[PDB]
A paper describes a structure:
Complete saturation of the azide-binding metal sites is not attained by exposure of CcO to 20 mm azide for 2 days, whereas elongation of the exposure time up to 4 days does not significantly change the X-ray crystal structures. As typically shown in the results obtained by a 2-day exposure to 20 mm azide, the process of azide binding to the metal sites does not tightly synchronize with the progress of the structural changes in the heme a3 and helix X. The azide saturation period was found to be somewhat dependent on the CcO preparation batch. Some CcO batches provided the crystals, which require 2 days for saturation of the two terminal azide-binding sites.
5 is the terminal oxidase of cellular respiration that reduces O2 to water, coupled with a proton-pumping process. The enzyme includes two redox-active metal sites as the low-potential sites (heme a (Fea) and CuA). These sites donate electrons to the O2 reduction site that comprises two high potential metal sites (heme a3 (Fea3) and CuB). The third proton-conducting pathway, the H-pathway, extends for proton pumping from the N-side surface to the P-side surface.
Residue numbers in the entry:
A (entry chain K): 6 to 54
B (entry chain E): 5 to 109
C (entry chain I): 1 to 73
D (entry chain M): 1 to 43
E (entry chain A): 1 to 514
F (entry chain B): 1 to 227
G (entry chain C): 3 to 261
H (entry chain H): 7 to 85
Write the structure that this text describes.
């Protein structure tokens, strides 16, 4: 007889992957986290003195 | 210690013992499959004939499945062993696991 | 019909192990050739090249003019 | 190992309840403290 | 009946179960403290307060995880349950003194919780160095309550070590030599010798610290001719053997779990595994000043401690390669306990190799007191002691309880924890090479990215700890009762059924000499 | 100082620090290789249905397992101990500077000639000037002459601290009643930062070290102006 | 019914009362040092004494009165007592290490010398040598007690053990007098610290060993020992030799070499 | 000779990281010298070297504490 | 004697899974919550 | 190193009794005389308030906080000198 | 010099200690202090395993010096064989208070 | 004195199901209750003292 | 048939590819036709039908090798559920960021970072490899 994995395995894999990627991308990009990446190639240095 | 031939000969003799009992048949096959080899046809032949003296058809079939399993992904080994055993399979009326559908998952 | 040939039946796990422990070693030599060339040698060369004609007074004057120091304006 | 089938099967719904209550027993009390940290400090 | 059975116990299995419950509760306390550390550090700035409350939390995190989670679970919990069964003994040699080793732990833990409630806590580091821990910079009761907590944990484990040594030497079947005992039993015997010799020296040093703080002695105060560096020697003369005490019973469980799920009757190279654990226990007493390479010691002393510390890699490597050779040719069963043991082999090897980096005293000048050391020991502690504990807990839970876990959930639990702990600790190597100090509540802005990711990792391990509690609940809630277990001919602790009767081996095994 | 997303050591400011970087690269390669050799044997053990479960002889293979690790340890220890004794060699300083750790700041004393000493405290975040570094800048920097061997002597007047400057390869603990010595030589002018490296109470995170390395004549005039 | 020789002990409250005595003594010392109160501490000392008394009473009931100490049980208790003595040796080792660390490298605060400036050590040829003779003598008299007991001689066992305890008490009274007379105190820098804490823990162990010998004396009076079975006496004799050897190391190290 | 004094030279009596006894010995030597010199009527200027060396090596607070204790009659080293 | 067997060799009852859930929640939950309340306590004092 | 006595050829209590009364107790009686000759108050040294002695970093938990546990007025000065 | 007054074990040992001492005098080992010596272990000459019940655990150290012990229950009835080396064992049940 | 060990052996071996710490009779029950009451009461008192000492004092 | 907890000391049945001939038959009690089939098995096996041979095999053993060794879909559930709970973790972290953490320090403001970057380049932070090495001091721009 098919067990839990045969019947629901594909859906648990697809939905858990979709959910995980969506929520981490949102967390990483949309809520004001300051990752502080390298300025190299990114920041234009500005006069400080 | 010994040559491959001597190893094989001691196992053939083990299973060829006329009054081998059920416990010794099981001890022999469950010991033999712990080694790094698939048993030569002549060893399997003597184990299958021990199954016959012990009136145990099912264990003859299981021995054939364990040969296939001990070959791992070398899929050329089992068909060669069954080829070599066919005269004994026919003489004892042993069906292979495939002829019985017992290879289906 | 034709009979199947007899295949090797004995020492299959030992044979597979022999084959791969040697492949595992050959990476290690090949990776050791990388790593060393991509990181270690590259570092020795970045330090040697940097210091070869490095002028510490000129580096100091550039810093002093950029106003970084307490002791030197 | 082999084992008997469950004497008192815990259905998917009951597992969702046990899992929720277990997660909340850790998340709620710590979340209440962390939420009120500014209250504790600015006090 | 309840009080006679659970407060007055003289039974090694019930006392083992008490230790497992205590160590599990401590593990939730040490886990919360670890998440407060990572919440403080998970963005730049100050979350909680200054370094006092922060290092109270860091200090309690270490003491709880070491003394109240790992030691009680590995030695009190698995040692008591398994050792007498693996040698066919009817109980421990001193079954009533065994119950006092257990009961001294709730009061020890109470004292440590009292330390953190009174005054401003003991924000000293788990090493409790003076003068920061002395009565001028840590006035008031907190640090004395911490010392007393360690005295009580110390007596509990010294009496436990006497009990295990005596039991293992004296209560085997008369035909069984010490070279016919399982590796987990050897691991407990060696760990108990290390406890017996090292704890009294820590007890001497923290007693000296107690009298400097309350009797006007000056062991560690230069004003009286004392020396703060003497405390460090006495503490680390215990503290290095202590990390081998935390891992050895783990090595013993890993040997059994690898053997069993490789379908083998025995571990590869049994006498080399015994030799390796004895040599590691021995060498673990002559290396302690690798914790003191920046204190100003002489060059030749630093050369000797570098070399002796590295030498431990030789017997330790024998064990790693012997676990590989035990998997070799196995009929591999991918059970959740097997996954925990394979994770152990790989993560312990990573952290042992960063320990080798650090044994070089010249490089340790720059890595000492930075997060490179934090990364080294969390790879051997939360990805070695913790993984060996979770491997042995899922492996033997059906023996102790009579019920099975759901293996799918337990594999999911292993997968979440393996991701979380590597996300947490792997970036701390970068923080340490680039110079972030230990015991800091906040860091220069350049260290933001790796601290953020390390904190996100600690939350993933929090989700794993919550799920583990659900998994244990689900097993007791569903009551799937164990029927047969594989390989009892080489795993004697299963042969009396699951769970075994309260009294086992009332008639001893029969073992002939021949 | 460290920069964002940094993986490895700060760039070397001193020849000894340079030696440590090459020695770390030598060691880390070994590390790489052993960890990968293990991961790989391990996946090899776990990826076949072939079995061999009967007793295996351990003697021969245990020789490989002890000897090869012993040789790899000797290949690490030889250059490790060369560096250890090289840093210990006599080098004749031109200047001695003392630093005393305190809760929570460092003081500095340059008393070869005059009585010069001052305190050095972290710049509070709310007083940083634009472009200055949070938790790292100090009000009074440790000005020192570049390209000169300097003896630093380190102690404390209260609890333990530890005086560190990672780009020069330096970390010496500050212990009351003890005077520990280290030597410092910068190949370059500039500003080189470190942070207290032994837990010392409420503001352990907030008592940094800033060295300012400049030509001798500038160091002399700065010294005279600090009296 | 068992067919092994080992002892299944009856369920007992004493491990719990002893663990709680420990909590009460340590929280009591904390109260005493910081909150000016001796109450918790006296309750913990009382419950610790009550626990010791009833636990060891029960071990005498289990052995002398109920017969559970077969040879295999006794052999375990031998190992137990040896391992306990080893852990007490290591505890003293920490204080010897503290003594040699401070005395071999005397700091400037002491005058850069040992004994420090301003310290006037006791003369090791006066009461300290007398105490040495006293404890060595009591090692000879306990060995006499042991051989009389093995030879079945009740009266000479009791006479030799009484001598041994009288010498224990003599050393304890001599040491109490020397502590009072000593012109330096525990607060007199690392000299007074090492002196009083190392000799003070040793004096505590002399008091513990003497108590254990007095327990053996009253059990002997009650005929509990046979000429072949008397492990409590052997354990007390090994612990007593331990206290004598520790004294010898303290005498040579602190009183003699350190004077 | 040895004006052009820059700092205290390497001293093979104190070759290790712990230099406490180097400061202490020079402080002692200086004061012992100065007592010898201002006893026997002679010139303290002969003690100058010890004074330079201890000033270079010794923390100001140690010198200051030792000087207060010599004045109080509680300096525990022998001069 | 004492009860023997699955569910009977432990100091807590597993006779009812929901009463068990409550006890396990209180048991592990109180250990996990304690350090947050200690920190709250330390913040509130001063 | 034998020492100089000279026994064996049987064994036990009798010989250890002989050692107890013929050597051990005589040695104690002798040392008890030696001690009771050099006993009795030796004259106390000038008080000097050395900072490495009479340490007080925290008051003692008995008495007025300033007296050691087995304080002897005759020979133990306080941080401020000998009592009245 | 040399009264008695000290009881001997023969006079005063009691309980299990006494049972062990009285049995050892008879050359008997009801409490399993000594290791049993093996027979040749064939089916005609099996190792004989005493027991006070209907089954007892056997550990078989198959060859001298093996570190691996092989454990199994031995039940009343026909001889059984160690599952590693085949040597034979037979249970001989019953009664203790001799 | 006389050797009364045989009397104690008969007492402690009486088949009355008592655990050894109560088998000497009513005085064992009394000393047990005294010990346990001091331990548990002392332990409550120690918790009270923790509560008192956990807060700055008035 | 029916394995009881109270049988743990008895030899038992197991399907394992490394112990092909277990210690007992999977089924020992036989019906009338099963007893007749065991008698027939004592005669030539060529006279057994295929169904009779399969019925003897299934009396002796529970599962065949192909059955006991089959692969399963379990990995989907494990990987998927692990990703689920990892995804749930990010909820916790969103919650903490919204309700627990306050503003980070002003030194992360864009203009501050531009000025600090120039000042790091002016003091030649890590000029050999790590930071200023990556700046072109001639062209006044990041190296390509
Ligand atoms: C379980 C705990 C555990 C274990 C097992 C270890 C194992 C080791 N540790 Fe660690 N360690 C800690 C817990 C542990 N450690 C803790 C808690 C601290 C800091 C304490 C504090 O300050 O709070 C610490 C600190 C610490 C320091 C001090 C760093 C500093 O503070 O500056 C050092 C330095 O030598 C060190 C080294 C090592 C070494 C060489 C090993 C070795 O024993 C590892 C040997 C293992 C291997 C090497 C891997 C397997 C081998 C092979 C696969 C063979 C091939 C290998 C080679 C040829 C090298 N450790
Ligand atoms: C006469 C023979 C010796 C017996 C000693 C009698 C008194 C107390 C007994 C305990 C002895 C143990 C050592 C503890 C440390 C200090 C006591 C040292 C011995 C002693 O009694 O030292 C006295 C000081 O006592 C003081 O402070 C006394 C303070 C008393 C407080 C005890 C402190 C509690 C210690 C906690 C111990 C923790 C135990 C660890 C167990 C380890 C776990 C494995 C010396 O008197 P003084 O006036 O300074 O100088 C003499 C001047 N004429
Ligand atoms: C000043 C007060 C505060 C400090 C507390 C300590 C105070 C004093 C404690 C003194 C120790 C008394 C111990 C009495 C033990 C009596 C029980 C006993 O001796 O029991 C014996 C077994 O030995 C056994 O368990 C041996 C078990 C003995 C171990 C005890 C010895 C030391 C314990 C010391 C605690 C150390 C504290 C360390 C300080 C850091 C009984 O077997 P037998 O003698 O063979 O008799 C049977 C024959 O009759 C049959 O024919
Ligand atoms: C380190 C481990 C911790 C990980 C993170 C925990 C995740 C949080 C779980 C939720 O915790 C709850 O969150 C609510 C907010 O969502 C809080 O309500 C607070 O906020 C509500 C909305 O503002 C108000 O209605 C409530 O009265 C007020 O208590 C509540 O107290 C707290 O229990
Ligand atoms: C049934 C089992 C047994 C459990 C027994 C529980 C006993 C409870 C009694 C507590 O009351 C007392 O209160 C005293 C004072 O009111 C305190 O002493 C202290 O009290 C003050 C604190 O400094 C000072 O006035 C004193 O000098 C100092 O000794 C001290 O806490 C205690 O003696
Ligand atoms: C009364 C008693 C007789 C012993 C007995 O056989 O019951 C004797 C035998 C040995 C005696 C003891 C030992 O001779 C040693 C002690 C000597 C002292 O002079 C009196 C008390 C002393 C402690 C004695 C008291 C008592 O007279 C004892 C105990
Ligand atoms: Cu100063 Cu940390
Ligand atoms: Cu260490
Ligand atoms: Mg440090
Ligand atoms: Na922070
Ligand atoms: Zn066998």
């Amino acid at each position: 007889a098919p067990d839990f994995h045969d019947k629901y395995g594909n859906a648990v894999l697809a939905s858990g992957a979709t959910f995980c990627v969506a929520v981490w991308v949102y967390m990483a990009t949309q809520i004001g986290i300051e990752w502080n990446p390298s300025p190299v190639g990114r920041v234009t240095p500005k006069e400080w003195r | 210690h010994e040559t491959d031939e001597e190893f094989d000969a001691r196992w053939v003799t083990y299973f060829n013992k006329p009054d081998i009992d059920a416990w010794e048949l099981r001890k022999g096959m469950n010991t033999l499959v712990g080694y790094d080899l698939v048993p030569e046809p002549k060893i399997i032949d003597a184990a299958l004939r021990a199954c016959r003296r012990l009136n145990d058809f099912a264990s003859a079939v299981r021995i054939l499945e364990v040969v296939k399993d001990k070959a791992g992904p070398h899929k050329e080994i089992y068909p060669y062993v069954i080829q070599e055993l066919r005269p004994t399979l026919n003489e004892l009326g042993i069906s292979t696991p495939e002829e019985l559908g017992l290879d289906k998952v | 019909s034709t009979a199947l040939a007899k295949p090797q039946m004995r020492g299959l796990l030992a044979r597979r192990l022999r084959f791969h422990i040697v492949g595992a070693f050959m990476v290690s030599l090949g990776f050791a050739t990388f790593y060393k060339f991509a990181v270690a040698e590259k570092r020795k060369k970045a330090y040697a090249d940097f210091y070869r004609n490095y002028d510490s007074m000129k580096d100091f004057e550039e810093m002093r003019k950029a106003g970084i120091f307490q002791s030197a304006k | 190992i082999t084992a008997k089938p469950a004497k008192t099967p815990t259905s998917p719904k009951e597992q969702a309840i046990g899992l929720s209550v277990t997660f909340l027993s850790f998340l709620l009390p710590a979340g209440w403290v962390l939420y009120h940290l500014d209250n504790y400090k600015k006090s | 009946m309840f009080i006679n059975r659970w407060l007055f116990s003289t039974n090694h299995k019930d006392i083992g179960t008490l230790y497992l419950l205590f160590g599990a509760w401590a593990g939730m306390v040490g886990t919360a403290l670890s998440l407060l550390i990572r919440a403080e550090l998970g963005q730049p700035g100050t979350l909680l307060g200054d370094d006092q409350i922060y290092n109270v939390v860091v200090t309690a995190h270490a003491f709880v995880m070491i003394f109240f989670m790992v030691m009680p679970i590995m030695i009190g919990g698995f040692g008591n349950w398994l050792v007498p069964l693996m040698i066919g003994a009817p109980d421990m040699a001193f079954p009533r003194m065994n119950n006092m080793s257990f009961w001294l732990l709730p009061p020890s833990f109470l004292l440590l919780l009292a330390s953190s409630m009174v005054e401003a806590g003991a924000g000293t580091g788990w090493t409790v160095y003076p003068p920061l821990a002395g009565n001028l910079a840590h006035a008031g009761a907190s640090v004395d309550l911490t010392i007393f907590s360690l005295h009580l944990a110390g007596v509990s484990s010294i009496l436990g070590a006497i009990n295990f040594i005596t039991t293992i030497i004296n209560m085997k079947p008369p035909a069984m030599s010490q070279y016919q005992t399982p590796l987990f039993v050897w691991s407990v015997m060696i760990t108990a010798v290390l406890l017996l010799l090292s704890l009294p020296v820590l007890a001497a040093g923290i007693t000296m610290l107690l009298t400097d703080r309350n009797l006007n002695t000056t062991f560690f105060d230069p004003a009286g001719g004392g020396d703060p560096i003497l405390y460090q020697h006495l503490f680390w003369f215990f503290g290095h053997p202590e990390v081998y005490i935390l891992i050895l019973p783990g090595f013993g469980m890993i040997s059994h779990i690898v053997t069993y799920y490789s379908g083998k009757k025995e571990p590869f190279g049994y006498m080399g595994m015994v030799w390796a654990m004895m040599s590691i226990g021995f060498l673990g007493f002559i290396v302690w000043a690798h914790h003191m390479f920046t204190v100003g010691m002489d060059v030749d002393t630093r050369a000797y401690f570098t070399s002796a510390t590295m030498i431990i890699a030789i017997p330790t490597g024998v064990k790693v390669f012997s676990w590989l050779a035990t998997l070799h040719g196995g009929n591999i069963k991918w059970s959740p306990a097997m996954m925990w043991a394979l994770g152990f082999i790989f993560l312990f090897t990573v952290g042992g190799l960063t320990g080798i980096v650090l044994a070089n005293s010249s490089l340790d000048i720059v890595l000492h007191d930075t997060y490179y050391v934090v990364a080294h020991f969390h790879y051997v502690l939360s990805m070695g002691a913790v993984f060996a504990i979770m491997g042995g807990f899922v492996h033997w839970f059906p023996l102790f309880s009579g019920y099975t876990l759901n293996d799918t959930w337990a594999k999911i639990h292993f997968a979440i924890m393996f991701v979380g702990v590597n996300m947490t600790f792997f970036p701390q190597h970068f923080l340490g090479l680039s110079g972030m100090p230990r015991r800091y509540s906040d860091y220069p802005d350049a260290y933001t990215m790796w601290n953020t990711i390390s904190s996100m990792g600690s939350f993933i391990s929090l989700t794993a700890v919550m799920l583990m509690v659900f998994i244990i609940w689900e097993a007791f809630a569903s009551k799937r009762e164990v029927l047969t277990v594989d390989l009892t001919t080489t795993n004697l602790e299963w042969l009396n059924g699951c769970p075994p009767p309260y009294h086992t081996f009332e008639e001893p095994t029969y073992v002939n000499l021949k | 100082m460290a920069y964002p997303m940094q993986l490895g050591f700060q760039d070397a400011t001193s020849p000894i620090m340079e030696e440590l970087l090459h020695f770390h690269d030598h060691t880390l390669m070994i590390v790489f290789l052993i960890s990968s050799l293990v991961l790989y044997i391990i996946s090899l053990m776990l990826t076949t249905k072939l079995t061999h479960t009967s007793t295996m002889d351990a003697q021969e293979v245990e020789t490989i397992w002890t000897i090869l690790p012993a040789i790899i340890l000797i290949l690490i220890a030889l250059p490790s101990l060369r560096i250890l004794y090289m840093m210990d060699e006599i080098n004749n300083p031109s200047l001695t500077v003392k630093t005393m750790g305190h809760q929570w700041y460092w003081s500095y004393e340059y008393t070869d000639y005059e009585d010069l000493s001052f305190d050095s405290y972290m710049i509070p975040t709310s007083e940083l000037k634009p472009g200055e570094l949070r938790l790292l800048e100090v009000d009074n920097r440790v000005v020192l002459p570049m390209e000169m061997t300097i003896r630093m002597l380190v102690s404390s007047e209260d609890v333990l601290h530890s005086w560190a400057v990672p780009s020069l390869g330096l970390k010496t603990d500050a212990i009351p009643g003890r005077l520990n010595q280290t030597t410092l030589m910068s190949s370059r002018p500039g500003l080189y930062y470190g942070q207290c490296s032994e837990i010392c109470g409420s503001n352990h995170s907030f008592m940094p070290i800033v060295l300012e390395l400049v030509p001798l004549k500038y160091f002399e005039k700065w010294s005279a102006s600090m009296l | 019914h068992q067919t092994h020789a080992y002892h299944m002990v009856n369920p007992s409250p004493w491990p719990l009362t002893g663990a709680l005595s420990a909590l009460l003594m340590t929280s009591g010392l904390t109260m005493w040092f910081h909150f000016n109160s001796m109450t918790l501490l006296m309750i913990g000392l009382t419950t610790n004494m009550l626990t010791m008394y009833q636990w060891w009473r029960d071990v005498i009931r289990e052995s002398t009165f109920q017969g559970h100490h077969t040879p295999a049980v006794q052999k375990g208790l031998r190992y137990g007592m040896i391992l306990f003595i080893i852990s007490e040796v290591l505890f003293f080792t920490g204080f010897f290490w503290a003594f040699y660390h401070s005395s071999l490298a005397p700091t400037p605060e002491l005058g850069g010398c040992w004994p420090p400036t301003g310290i006037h050590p006791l003369n090791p040829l006066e009461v300290p040598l007398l105490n040495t003779s006293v404890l060595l003598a009591s090692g000879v008299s306990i060995t006499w007690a042991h051989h009389s007991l093995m030879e079945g001689d009740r009266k000479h066992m009791l006479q030799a053990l009484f001598i041994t305890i009288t010498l224990g008490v003599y050393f304890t009274l001599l040491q109490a007098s020397e502590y009072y007379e000593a012109p330096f105190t525990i607060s007199d820098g690392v000299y007074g610290s090492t002196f009083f804490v190392a000799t003070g823990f040793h004096g505590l162990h002399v008091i513990i060993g003497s108590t254990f010998l007095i327990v053996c004396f009253f059990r002997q009076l009650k005929f509990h020992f046979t000429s072949n079975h008397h492990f409590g006496f052997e354990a007390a004799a090994w612990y007593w030799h331990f206290v004598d050897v520790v004294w010898l190391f303290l005498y040579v190290s602190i009183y003699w070499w350190g004077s | 000779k040895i004006k052009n004094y820059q700092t205290a030279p390497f001293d093979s009596r104190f070759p290790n990281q712990n230099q406490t006894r180097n400061c202490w010995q020079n402080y002692l030597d200086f004061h012992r010298c100065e007592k010898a010199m201002t006893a026997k009527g002679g010139d303290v200027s002969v003690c100058e070297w010890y004074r330079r060396v201890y000033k270079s090596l010794c923390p100001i607070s140690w010198v200051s504490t030792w000087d207060d204790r010599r004045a109080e009659g509680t300096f525990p080293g022998k001069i | 004697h004492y009860e023997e067997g699955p569910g009977k060799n432990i100091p807590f009852s597993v006779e009812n899974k929901w009463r068990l859930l409550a006890m396990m929640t209180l048991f592990f939950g109180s250990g996990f919550a304690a350090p947050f309340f200690i920190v709250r306590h330390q913040l509130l004092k001063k | 190193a034998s020492a100089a006595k000279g026994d064996h050829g049987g064994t036990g209590a009798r010989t250890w009794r002989f050692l107890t009364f013929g050597l051990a107790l005589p040695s104690v009686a002798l040392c008890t005389l030696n001690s009771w000759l050099h006993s009795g108050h030796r004259e106390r040294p000038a008080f000097i308030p050395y900072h490495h002695l009479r340490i007080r970093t925290k008051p003692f938990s008995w008495g007025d906080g300033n007296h050691t546990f087995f304080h002897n007025p005759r020979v133990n000065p306080l941080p401020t000198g000998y009592e009245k | 010099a040399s009264g008695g007054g000290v009881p001997t074990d023969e006079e005063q040992a009691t309980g299990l200690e006494r049972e062990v001492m009285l049995a050892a005098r008879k050359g008997q080992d009801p409490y399993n202090i000594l290791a049993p010596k093996a027979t040749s272990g064939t089916k005609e000459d099996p190792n004989l395993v005493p027991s006070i019940t209907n089954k007892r655990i056997v550990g078989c150290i198959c060859e001298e010096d093996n570190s691996t012990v092989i454990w199994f229950w031995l039940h009343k009835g026909e001889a059984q064989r160690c599952p590693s080396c085949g040597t034979h064992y037979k249970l001989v049940p019953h009664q203790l208070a001799h | 004195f006389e050797n009364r060990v045989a009397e104690k052996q008969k007492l402690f071996q009486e088949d009355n199901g008592l655990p050894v710490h109560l088998k000497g009779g009513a005085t064992d029950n009394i000393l047990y209750r005294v010990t346990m009451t001091l331990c548990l009461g002392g332990t409550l008192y120690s918790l009270y003292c923790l509560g008192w000492a956990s807060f700055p004092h008035k | 048939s029916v394995v009881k907890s109270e049988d743990y000391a008895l030899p038992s049945y197991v399907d394992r590819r490394d112990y092909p001939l277990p210690d007992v038959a999977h089924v020992k009690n036989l019906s009338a036709s099963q007893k007749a089939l065991k008698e027939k098995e004592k005669a030539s096996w060529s006279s057994l039908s295929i169904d009779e041979k399969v019925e003897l095999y299934r009396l002796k053993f529970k599962e065949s090798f192909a059955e006991m060794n089959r692969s399963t879909n379990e990995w989907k559930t494990v990987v998927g559920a692990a990703m689920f709970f990892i995804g749930f973790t990010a909820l916790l972290l969103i919650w903490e960021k919204h309700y627990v953490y306050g503003p980070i320090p002003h030194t992360f403001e864009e203009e501050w970072v531009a000025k600090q970057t120039k000042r790091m380049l002016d003091m030649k932070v890590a000029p050999i490899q790590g930071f200023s090495a990556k700046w072109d001091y001639d062209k006044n721009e990041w190296k390509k």
